TrEMBL record, chain C:
This is NADH dehydrogenase [ubiquinone] 1 alpha subcomplex subunit 11. InterPro entries: NDUFA11 (IPR039205). It comes from the Eukaryota. The lineage of its organism: Eukaryota, Metazoa, Chordata, Craniata, Vertebrata. Accessory subunit of the mitochondrial membrane respiratory chain NADH dehydrogenase (Complex I), that is believed not to be involved in catalysis. Complex I functions in the transfer of electrons from NADH to the respiratory chain. The immediate electron acceptor for the enzyme is believed to be ubiquinone. The gene is Ndufa11. Complex I is composed of 45 different subunits. It comes from Mus musculus (Mouse). Coiled coil: none annotated. The keyword Membrane applies.
Length: 171, 105, 140, 120, 98, 48, 115, 344, 171, 80
C-alpha cells in the first residue's frame, strides 16, 4: 500500500483529461466530482482532512447548480458523451497511452528527481512531529480569525459584492 | 511593493506570513525553519544581486532541505546497489531490516 | 538544438555550402510552420485537406526562400572571395525575394521582397560582424 | 532604481534632507510656465462651455493659476531633492570605488598624432 | 510527492489546453476552469502539509472563494447568452468584428 | 553495501553546514521493510 | 483499510443485488415497453430540450452561501485561541455582511422566481 | 443601477488594484486582479444587448485563464521556495508563464485579439476604465519583478504589440477600436523598457492615460463612435478641434508635445543598453501609428465634412458636459515638454 | 561533503523502563514533582542545543530517575497503583474522570509513605528556572560569518552640479 | 413606532427575533464579567511544552520547581 498516492494522482489526471475533452456538462461534472473526491483522498494521504472534505462539499454544491443550468441552457438533443465521438475516444485512449509512455520515459531519462517508480512511497510526509497536539489543519484555516484577519475580510467582501454583481448581471 | 502603505502605517496585513519561518498558530516549527531563517538573515542589508552570490551556500542548504533531491538520489543509489548484490547472491540483510528486531523502549 | 543553428558561424561563408544551405532551409521551414499555424487557427479553411495544403504551401515556400538564400550566400562568398562582405547576403536575400515572387506569382512582390530581404540580410551580417546584440541583457 | 536606497522612507514627499536644499525663487521660469498652463486651462474651459474668454471666470482662472503654481513649487522641490540624491550617491560611489574610475590624465596635441584627411 | 506534484501540474496543463481549445459549448470551458482551480488547490494544500506551514493553509480557501465567484459570474453571463441567442453555443458571438 | 563503488563517503551529508538536520521518514525506514514504511505514513491517518 | 473495506463491501452488495435483479428474472423485450412513459400517450417532443429554470439566481447565491459556510466552519478551532475578540468581531462582521446581502437580494426580489 | 450597488462596484474596482499594490503576497495580488475582473463586468453589461454580453463573456473568459496561469506560477514558486514572493533564483519558466499571462491580461500582441472587440462592445465609459485603471495593477506585478524578466520575449511582445497596433488602427472606422490599438502600441512601448529603468514605464502610462481620458470624453460629448460622427463636430462642438488635434498629435509622438517625450527617453535608455535596431523599428512603426491619427484629424478639423439639417437643434440647445478636467488633462498634455526633467 | 558523526550502539544502551502508557499517565503527576530537575535540565540541553547527539547522558539520567521513581512505587503502593492504572487502561482516551476513587487511594498511600504531595491544576505548566554547570552554546545553528552590508554614503547633500544634466535644460 | 413593532411582532415575528438576537449577541459580551476568563482559559491550556529558562541568578519571580508559590496560579479556574 505504497502506490496509493500515485494511483490517486493518475486517476485525477485521467479525470481532468476526460474533462478537457469536453463532453456534455453532465458527464463533465461527473468527472469533476470524481476528480474532487480523488483530490480529497490524496490531500488526506498527505495528512489533510478538513481541506479535502471542504473540496468535496464545495464542488458538490457547485456541480448541483451546474446540472441545473445545463439542463436549462447547455443541453442538446444528443448530449455527445465520450464514446459518441470516435475522435474523442481516440484522444482519450491516446492520452492514457501517452501518460504511460511518458512516465516510463521520465523513469529512464533521469535516475530520480521527476518520477521515481522504484522509490515510491518513501517520500510522502517529510518530518512528522511524532509527538504533537493542536497540529492538524483547521488551526491554520482558523487563523483567518487570528493572525490572518485580512484573508477573511477580503473573501467576505468578495462574496458580498458578488451578490450585487450577480443581481445586476441577471437584471 | 509598489505602494508601501503598510510600512508607512506600521501595520502588517499580509507581510507576516510570507515565508515558512513565520509564526505558525501554535508554535510548531515548519520544516527548514532554520535554513530559511539563515538564508534570510544572511540576505539582509544586502539586496539581490549580491545576496545571490554571498548567501548561496545557505540557499543551497535550504533548497536541499525543502525539495530534498540529494537524499533521494543517495537512497536510490544505495537501494540499487543493494538489489544488485542481493541478485548476485552476495548480500543478506540483517534481522532488524526484514522485520525481526528487539524494539528499543 | 541551438547548437545546430549556431554552427552556421563556425566556418565562414564560401565553406560548407550544403551545411549552411539546409540549415537555413530548416530555419525557413520552421518559420513557415509558425505562419501556417497562425493562418489555420485564424482564418481556417473549409476542410482539413485544404488546411494541410495551405500548410505545405507555406512551409515549402519558406524552405525554398531559405535554401536559395543559403546557396547564394555561400556561392557568392566562394566566388569573389570576400566572406566579410554583406553584399553576398544582399544577393542571397534578393534570390529569396525572387523565389517569393515565383511561388506567389507577382513581380511587385518579387522586387519588394528582394530589396527588403537583401537590406535585412546585409544588416544581419553587419550585426554578426560588428557585435550587435538584439535582445541585450540589462547592463546600463 | 533608487527606491532601495538606505534611509528611503516609504511614501515620503519631502524628507528633512531636502530642507538643506535651496528652494526655488518663486519667480522661476517653469513655475510661471505652470501659471501660464493654468491660465490657458481656464481659457480653454471657457471656450469649451461657450463662455467669454478672458472675461468670464476670473475666480476660476485665479484658482487654476494658484493650483498649478502651488503644486509645481513642491513637486519641483521634490525633483531637485531627487537629482541631488542622484549626484550625492554618484560622487560617494566614485569616492568608494576609485580603482574603477582611475585618475586619468591625457597628453597634448604635440605628443599624439591624429591622421590627416585631405579634402582636395 | 514529486510524482503527484508532476501529475497535478500535467492535470492543470490538460485543463488549460481544454479551456483554450473550444467546442460549441461554454459551460465545458467553465468546467475546465473549475478543474484548473481544483488542481491548484490540491498543489497548494499538499505543499502546505508537506512543509507543515499552517500559516499558508488559509490560501486554498481563498482560492475556492474567488474561483466559485468566477464560476458564479460566468454562469450569469451564460444566462444572458441563452436569453439572447437561445442555444448556448459559442459560434454565435461573432458580431463584434463588424 | 557500497564497498564495491569507486568513490563514496558512507556517512556523508548533503549540506555544507555542520549542525544537526533531523532526519525524515525516508532516510530512516528507507532500508527497512515496506510495512514499517506504510506504518510511518498511513498509521495515524489510516486510524487504529 | 477499514473504511475502504466497508465501502468496498457496500459497493459489492449493490452490484451483486443489481446482477441479481437483471439476470434472475425472465424477459420479454419489445419497443412498446422500452419507449418512454409520458402518461399513456407518446411524447410530443424530447426530454433533452432546454428546461427553463426560475431559481437560477438563488442557485448562484447558494454557491456563495456555501463558500460562506466554508469560511464559518473553522470556528470550533478558532474559539480555542487566546485573543477571542478579533475572532468575535470578524465572525460578527462575516455573519452580518452575509445577512445584509441576503436582505438586499430579498428586497430586490431575487429570492422570488421569474414568473 | 441603484446607488448602493454602484458604491459597492466602484469601491471594489478601486480596491482591486489598491490591493494589488499594497500586497507583498502574490496571492493577494491575484485577489486584487480578480476583484477588478469581477466588478468590471456589471458595467460592461449594463445596457444588456448582444454586443455587451459578448464583450463581457470574452473579457471574463480571457482574464480567468490568465488569472489561473498566474496562480500556477505562484503555487510553483511556493513549492520551490516556500514563499509567496518572486525572489531571485526562481525558474525562468515560472517567470515567463507569469509574463505571458499578464500580457494576456493587458492586451499585448499576440494576445491582443480580445481588446478591440471588447472596447467596441461597450460604452465610451468602461472603455476609459478598461484602458486606464485596469492596466495599472498588471503593470505593478511586472514593475515589482523587473530584474527577473527575460529581455528577449519582453521585447518580442513589445515589437509585436507595436506592429499589430499600428496595422490594426490603420483601417478602423470605429474609434473605440482605434483607442484600443493605441493602447496596445503604448503598452508595447512600456513593456519594452520595463526591464530598463521602470520609472519610464509609469511615465508613459501616465502620459497615455492623460491623453486617452480626454479623448474618450471628447467622444462622450456627442456619443461619437465613428469617423463620420466625429466629423460632424465643427457644427456641434467646434471649440474642441484644437485640443483633439494637439492630443492626437501627442498620442502619435511629435516633438513639441509631451507625447514624444516617452518615446524619446525610452529610445535613450534603450540605446544606453545597445537595444539599437529594435528601438529603430519601434520608432519607425510609431509613424504608421501616427498616420491614422493624421487622417482622423483631417476628417474632423482641417477639411470639415458635410453636416445634417437636424444638427441645428443642437446649435439651439445648450450643453453642460465638459467636466473642468478635460481642459486640465489636455493642457498638461500637449504643452508640458519643457517640464520633462521634472517628469522623467 | 562533510560526514555525520553518530554515536555507537553502546553509547545508546540504557536501563529502560519497559512500561506501558496507562501506568505511566497514572504516575505522571508525581513524576512531574519528583524527578523534575533532571527532566528540565535535559529539556534545556535538548532545546538550547539543537543536537540530540550532545544530550545522551542527560537522557540516561532521566531514565534512571524514572527507574528509581517506579522502584519506590514498587516498594510501597504497588497494588493500589496497579488497581488505579488497571481501571485507567480500560478507557479509550485514558481519562482520569472515570478513575477517581482510585486516585484517592494511590495519593493517600504515597502521601503516608514517601510523603509525596500531588501538584495542583496548573503547577506543571510554567517555566521553572534550572541551573547547570554547563556553558551556553556559542553560536547555535552554526551560523556562518555574515557578509558586511554595503557602506552608507556620508554627507549633507547639496544642489545637483549644474542642475539637471538632461539634454539642454540649463537649470 | 411602538405600534409598528407591536404589528411586526404579529406579522413577521421571525425577523424580529433575528434582529433582537443579533443585537443581544453583540451587546451581552460587553456587559458580562465572565468574558475575560475565556481568553485566560485559552491561554492556560498547555498544548506545547513550557521550555525552562537558564538560571542567571537574577530570576527571583520565576520558580525553580513546579510546586512553588511563584508563577501564574490557576486557582481562579478552580472554585470559579
Ligand atoms: C513644474 C511642474 C512639473 C510637472 C507637473 C505635472 C506634469 C503632469 C504630467 C505628468 C505625467 C508623468 C508623471 C509620471 C510620474 O509622476 O513619475 C513616475 C513615478 C515614478 O515612480 P518611482 O520613482 O519609479 O517609484 C516610486 C516608489 O515605488 C514609491 O516610493 P517613493 O519613495 O518614490 O514615494 C512616492 C511619492 C510619490 O508622490 C509623488 O510625488 C508622485 C506624484 C506624481 C503625480 C503626477 C503629478 O510619495 C507619495 O507616495 C505621496 C504620498 C504622500 C503621503 C502623505 C505624506 O511614479 C510614481 O511615483 C507614482 C506614485 C503614485 C503615488 C500614489
Ligand atoms: C509673463 C508674465 C508672467 C510673470 C513674468 C515674471 C517676470 C520675472 O521677473 O521672472 C521671469 C523669469 C525669471 O526671470 P530671471 O530669473 O531674471 O531670468 C531667468 C532666465 O531667463 C533663465 O531662464 P532659462 O533659460 O534658464 O529657462 C529655464 C527652463 C525653462 O523653463 C521655462 O520657463 C519654459 C520656457 C518655455 C520654452 O529651462 C531652460 O533652461 C530652457 C529650456 C527650454 C525648453 C523648451 C523646449 C521646448 C521648445 C518649445 C516647444 C513649444 C511649446 C510647446 C507646444 C506649444 C503648442 C501647444 O523668467 C521667465 O519666466 C522668462 C522665460 C524665458 C523664456 C525662455 C524661452 C526659451
Ligand atoms: C492649432 C490647431 C488648430 C486646429 C484647427 C481648428 C480649426 O479648424 O479652426 C476652427 C475653424 C472654425 O472656425 P469658427 O467656427 O469660426 O470657430 C468657432 C469659435 O469657437 C468661436 O469662438 P468665439 O468667437 O465665440 O470666441 C473667440 C474665441 C476664439 O478662440 C478659439 O476658438 C481658438 C483659439 C486657439 C488659439 C491657438 C493659438 C495657437 C498658439 C500657438 C503658439 O476666444 C478668443 O477670443 C481667443 C482668446 C485667445 C486664445 C485662447 C486659447 C487658449 C488655449 C491656448 C492653447 C494653445 C495651444 C497652442 O474651422
Ligand atoms: C468516469 C470518470 C471520468 C474518467 C474518463 C472517462 C473514462 C470512461 C469512458 C467510458 C466511455 C463511456 C461512454 O462513452 O459513454 C457510454 C455511456 C452511455 O451509454 P448509452 O446511453 O450510449 O447506452 C448504451 C447502451 N448499451 C449498453 C446497450 C450499449 O456513458 C458512460 O458510460 C459514461 C458514464 C461513466 C462511465 C464510467 C465507467 C466506470 C465503471 C463504473 C461502473
Ligand atoms: C521560435 C522561432 C521564432 C520564429 C519566428 C517566425 C516569424 C513568423 C512570422 C509571423 C507569422 C505570420 C503568419 C501570417 O502570414 O499571418 C497570416 C494570418 C492570416 O492568415 P492568411 O490571411 O490566410 O495568410 C495570408 C498570407 N500572408 O494573419 C494573422 O492571423 C496574424 C497573426 C500574427 C501573429 C504573429 C505573432 C508571431 C510572433 C510571436 C512573438 C512571441
Ligand atoms: C493543438 C492543435 C489542435 C489541432 C486541431 C485538431 C482537431 C481536434 O481534435 O481538436 C479540436 C477540438 C475542438 O473541438 P471541435 O471544434 O468541436 O472539433 C470537432 C470535434 N467534433 O478540440 C477540443 O475539443 C478539445 C481537445 C482537448 C484535448 C485534451 C487532451 C489532449 C491529449 C490528446
Ligand atoms: C524615405 C522615403 C519614404 C517616403 C514615404 C512617404 C509615403 C507617403 C504615403 C502616402 C500614400 C498615399 C497614397 C494615396 C494616393 C491615392 C490613391 C487612390 O486613389 O486611392 C485608392 C487607393 C487604392 O489603390 P490600390 O493600391 O491600387 O488598391 C486598390 C486595388 N485593389 O487607396 C489607398 O490606398 C489609400 C491610401 C492608403 C494609405 C495606406 C497607409 C499609408 C502608410 C504610409 C507609410 C507610413 C510610414 C510607415 C513607416 C514604416
Amino acid at each position: 500500500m505504497n502506490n496509493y498516492i500515485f494511483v490517486l494522482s493518475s486517476l485525477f489526471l485521467v479525470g481532468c483529461l476526460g474533462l478537457a475533452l469536453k463532453p456534455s456538462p453532465i458527464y463533465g461534472g461527473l468527472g469533476l466530482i470524481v476528480s474532487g473526491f480523488v483530490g480529497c483522498l490524496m490531500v488526506l494521504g498527505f495528512g489533510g482532512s478538513f481541506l479535502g472534505l471542504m473540496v468535496f462539499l464545495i464542488y458538490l454544491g457547485g456541480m448541483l447548480v451546474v446540472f441545473g443550468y445545463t439542463t436549462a441552457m447547455a443541453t442538446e438533443e444528443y448530449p455527445e458523451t465520450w464514446g459518441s465521438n470516435w475522435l474523442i475516444l481516440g484522444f482519450l485512449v491516446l492520452g492514457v497511452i501517452m501518460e504511460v509512455f511518458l512516465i516510463c520515459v521520465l523513469n529512464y531519462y533521469d535516475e530520480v528527481g521527476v518520477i521515481n517508480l522504484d522509490g515510491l512511497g518513501d517520500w510522502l510526509m517529510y518530518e512528522v512531529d511524532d509527538v504533537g497536539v493542536m497540529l492538524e489543519g483547521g488551526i491554520g484555516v482558523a487563523a483567518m480569525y487570528s493572525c490572518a484577519t485580512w484573508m477573511m475580510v477580503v473573501a467576505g467582501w468578495s462574496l458580498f459584492a458578488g451578490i450585487f454583481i450577480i443581481i445586476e448581471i441577471t437584471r | 511593493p509598489f505602494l508601501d502603505i503598510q510600512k508607512k502605517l506600521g501595520i502588517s496585513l499580509d507581510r507576516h506570513f510570507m515565508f515558512l519561518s513565520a509564526e505558525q498558530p501554535y508554535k510548531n516549527a515548519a520544516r527548514c525553519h532554520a535554513f530559511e531563517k539563515e538564508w534570510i538573515e544572511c540576505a539582509h542589508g544586502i539586496g539581490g544581486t549580491r545576496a545571490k552570490k554571498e548567501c548561496k551556500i545557505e540557499f543551497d542548504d535550504f533548497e536541499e532541505c525543502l525539495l530534498r533531491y540529494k537524499t533521494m538520489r543517495r537512497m536510490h543509489d544505495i537501494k540499487k546497489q543493494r538489489e544488485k548484490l542481493m541478485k548476485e547472491g552476495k548480500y543478506t540483510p540483517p534481522p532488524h531490516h526484514s522485520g525481526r528486531e528487539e524494539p528499543r523502549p | 538544438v541551438k547548437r545546430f543553428f549556431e554552427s552556421y558561424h563556425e566556418v565562414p561563408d564560401g565553406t560548407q555550402c550544403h551545411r549552411k544551405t539546409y540549415i537555413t532551409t530548416a530555419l525557413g521551414g520552421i518559420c513557415g510552420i509558425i505562419g501556417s499555424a497562425y493562418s489555420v487557427s485564424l482564418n481556417p479553411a473549409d476542410s482539413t485537406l485544404e488546411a494541410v495544403a495551405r500548410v505545405g504551401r507555406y512551409t515549402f515556400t519558406a524552405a525554398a526562400i531559405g535554401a536559395m538564400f543559403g546557396l547564394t550566400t555561400c556561392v557568392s562568398a566562394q566566388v569573389r572571395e570576400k566572406p566579410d562582405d554583406p553584399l553576398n547576403y544582399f544577393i542571397g536575400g534578393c534570390a529569396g525575394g525572387l523565389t517569393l515572387g515565383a511561388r506567389t506569382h507577382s513581380y511587385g512582390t518579387a522586387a519588394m521582397g528582394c530589396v527588403y530581404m537583401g537590406t535585412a540580410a546585409a544588416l544581419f551580417k553587419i550585426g554578426k560582424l560588428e557585435g550587435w546584440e538584439l535582445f541585450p541583457t540589462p547592463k546600463v | 532604481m533608487m527606491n532601495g536606497r538606505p534611509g528611503h522612507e516609504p511614501l515620503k514627499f519631502l524628507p528633512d534632507e531636502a530642507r538643506s536644499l535651496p528652494p526655488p525663487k518663486l519667480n522661476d521660469p517653469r513655475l510661471v510656465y505652470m501659471g501660464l498652463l493654468g491660465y490657458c486651462t481656464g481659457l480653454m474651459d471657457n471656450m469649451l462651455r461657450m463662455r467669454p474668454v478672458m472675461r468670464a471666470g476670473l475666480h476660476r482662472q485665479l484658482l487654476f493659476v494658484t493650483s498649478f503654481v502651488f503644486a509645481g513649487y513642491f513637486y519641483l522641490k521634490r525633483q531637485n531633492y531627487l537629482y541631488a540624491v542622484k549626484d550625492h550617491d554618484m560622487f560617494g560611489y566614485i569616492k568608494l570605488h576609485p580603482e574603477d574610475f582611475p585618475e586619468k590624465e591625457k597628453k597634448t596635441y604635440a605628443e599624439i598624432l591624429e591622421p590627416f584627411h585631405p579634402v582636395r | 510527492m514529486p510524482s503527484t506534484f508532476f501529475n497535478l501540474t500535467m492535470a492543470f496543463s490538460l485543463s488549460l489546453l481544454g479551456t483554450l481549445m473550444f467546442r460549441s459549448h461554454l459551460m465545458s470551458t467553465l468546467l475546465c476552469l473549475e478543474g484548473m482551480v481544483l488542481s491548484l488547490f490540491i498543489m497548494t494544500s499538499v505543499t502546505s502539509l508537506n512543509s507543515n506551514s499552517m500559516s499558508s493553509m488559509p490560501i486554498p480557501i481563498t482560492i475556492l472563494v474567488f474561483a466559485a465567484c468566477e464560476a458564479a459570474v460566468g454562469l450569469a453571463l451564460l444566462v444572458k447568452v441563452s436569453n439572447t441567442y437561445g442555444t448556448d453555443y459559442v459560434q454565435n458571438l461573432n458580431l463584434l468584428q463588424c | 553495501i557500497m564497498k564495491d563503488v569507486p568513490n563514496w563517503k558512507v556517512g556523508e551529508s548533503v549540506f555544507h553546514t555542520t549542525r544537526w538536520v533531523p532526519p525524515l521518514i525516508g532516510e530512516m525506514y528507507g532500508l527497512r521493510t515496506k510495512e514499517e514504511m506504510s506504518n510511518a505514513n498511513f498509521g495515524f491517518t489510516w486510524y487504529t | 483499510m477499514n473504511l475502504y473495506t466497508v465501502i468496498f463491501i457496500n459497493i459489492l452488495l449493490s452490484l451483486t443485488l443489481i446482477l441479481v435483479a437483471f439476470w434472475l428474472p425472465q424477459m420479454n423485450l419489445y419497443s412498446e415497453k422500452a419507449n418512454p412513459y409520458e402518461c399513456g400517450f407518446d411524447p410530443t417532443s424530447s426530454a433533452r430540450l432546454p428546461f427553463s429554470m426560475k431559481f437560477f439566481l438563488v442557485a448562484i447565491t447558494f454557491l456563495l452561501f456555501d463558500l460562506e459556510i466554508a469560511l464559518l466552519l473553522p470556528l470550533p478551532w478558532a474559539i480555542q485561541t487566546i485573543k477571542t475578540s478579533t475572532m468575535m468581531i470578524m465572525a460578527f462582521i462575516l455573519v452580518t455582511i452575509l445577512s445584509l446581502g441576503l436582505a438586499y437580494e430579498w428586497t430586490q426580489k431575487g429570492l422570488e422566481w421569474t414568473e | 443601477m441603484n446607488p448602493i450597488t454602484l458604491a459597492i462596484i466602484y469601491f471594489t474596482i478601486f480596491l482591486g488594484p489598491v490591493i494589488t499594490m499594497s500586497s507583498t503576497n502574490l496571492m493577494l495580488m491575484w485577489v486584487g486582479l480578480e476583484f477588478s475582473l469581477l466588478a468590471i463586468i456589471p458595467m460592461l453589461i449594463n445596457k444588456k444587448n448582444p454586443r455587451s454580453t459578448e464583450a463581457a463573456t470574452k473579457y471574463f473568459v480571457t482574464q480567468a485563464t490568465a488569472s489561473m496561469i498566474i496562480l500556477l506560477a505562484i503555487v510553483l514558486n511556493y513549492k520551490q521556495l516556500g514563499t509567496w514572493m518572486f525572489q531571485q533564483q526562481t525558474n525562468g519558466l515560472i517567470l515567463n508563464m507569469t509574463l505571458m499571462a499578464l500580457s494576456m491580461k493587458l492586451g499585448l500582441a499576440p494576445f491582443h485579439f480580445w481588446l478591440p472587440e471588447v472596447t467596441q462592445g461597450i460604452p465610451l465609459h468602461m472603455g476609459l476604465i478598461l484602458l486606464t485603471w485596469q492596466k495599472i495593477a498588471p503593470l505593478s506585478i511586472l514593475i515589482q519583478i523587473y530584474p527577473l524578466l527575460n529581455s528577449t520575449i519582453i521585447l518580442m511582445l513589445a515589437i509585436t504589440s507595436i506592429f499589430m497596433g499600428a496595422w490594426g488602427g490603420l483601417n478602423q472606422t470605429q474609434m473605440r477600436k482605434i483607442m484600443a490599438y493605441s493602447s496596445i502600441a503604448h503598452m508595447g512601448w512600456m513593456l519594452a523598457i520595463l526591464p530598463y529603468n521602470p520609472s519610464l514605464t509609469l511615465l508613459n502610462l501616465m502620459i497615455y492615460i492623460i491623453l486617452t481620458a480626454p479623448m474618450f470624453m471628447a467622444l462622450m460629448l456627442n456619443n461619437s463612435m465613428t469617423i463620420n460622427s466625429i466629423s460632424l463636430l465643427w457644427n456641434k462642438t467646434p471649440a474642441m478641434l484644437t485640443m483633439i488635434s494637439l492630443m492626437l498629435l501627442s498620442l502619435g509622438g511629435l516633438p513639441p508635445l509631451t507625447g514624444f517625450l516617452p518615446k524619446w527617453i525610452i529610445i535613450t535608455e534603450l540605446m544606453k543598453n545597445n537595444c539599437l535596431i529594435m528601438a529603430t523599428l519601434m520608432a519607425m512603426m510609431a509613424l504608421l501609428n501616427l498616420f491614422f491619427y493624421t487622417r482622423l484629424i483631417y476628417s474632423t478639423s482641417l477639411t470639415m465634412f458635410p453636416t445634417n439639417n437636424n444638427s441645428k437643434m443642437m446649435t439651439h440647445q445648450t450643453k453642460t458636459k465638459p467636466n473642468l478636467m478635460f481642459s486640465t488633462l489636455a493642457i498638461m498634455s500637449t504643452m508640458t515638454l519643457p517640464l520633462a526633467p521634472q517628469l522623467i | 561533503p562533510g560526514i555525520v558523526e553518530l554515536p555507537t550502539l553502546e553509547e545508546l544502551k540504557v536501563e529502560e523502563v519497559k512500561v506501558s502508557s496507562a501506568v505511566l499517565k497514572a504516575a505522571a503527576h508525581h513524576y512531574g514533582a519528583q524527578c523534575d530537575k533532571t527532566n528540565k535540565e535535559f529539556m534545556l540541553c535538548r532545546w538550547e542545543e539543537k543536537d540530540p547527539r550532545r544530550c545522551l547522558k542527560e537522557g540516561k539520567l532521566v531514565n534512571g530517575c524514572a527507574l528509581n521513581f517506579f522502584r519506590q512505587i514498587k516498594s510501597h503502593c504497588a497494588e493500589p497503583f496497579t488497581e488505579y492504572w488497571t481501571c485507567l487502561d480500560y478507557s479509550n482516551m485514558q481519562l482520569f474522570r472515570h478513575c477517581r476513587q482510585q486516585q484517592a487511594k494511590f495519593d493517600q498511600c504515597v502521601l503516608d509513605k514517601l510523603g509525596w504531595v500531588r501538584p495542583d491544576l496548573g503547577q506543571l505548566s510554567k517555566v521553572t528556572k534550572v541551573k547547570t554547570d554547563r556553558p551556553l552554546p556559542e553560536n547555535p545553528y552554526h551560523s556562518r560569518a555574515r557578509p558586511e552590508p554595503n557602506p552608507v554614503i556620508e554627507g549633507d547633500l547639496k544642489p545637483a552640479k549644474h542642475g539637471t544634466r538632461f539634454f539642454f535644460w540649463t537649470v | 413606532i411602538s405600534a409598528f413593532l407591536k404589528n411586526a411582532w404579529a406579522k413577521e415575528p421571525v425577523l424580529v427575533v433575528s434582529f433582537s438576537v443579533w443585537g443581544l449577541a453583540i451587546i451581552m459580551p460587553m456587559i458580562s464579567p465572565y468574558t475575560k476568563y475565556a481568553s485566560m482559559i485559552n491561554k492556560a491550556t498547555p498544548y506545547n511544552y513550557p521550555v525552562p529558562v537558564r538560571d542567571d541568578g537574577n530570576m527571583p519571580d520565576v520558580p525553580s520547581h513546579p510546586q512553588d508559590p511563584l508563577g501564574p496560579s490557576l486557582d481562579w479556574l478552580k472554585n470559579l
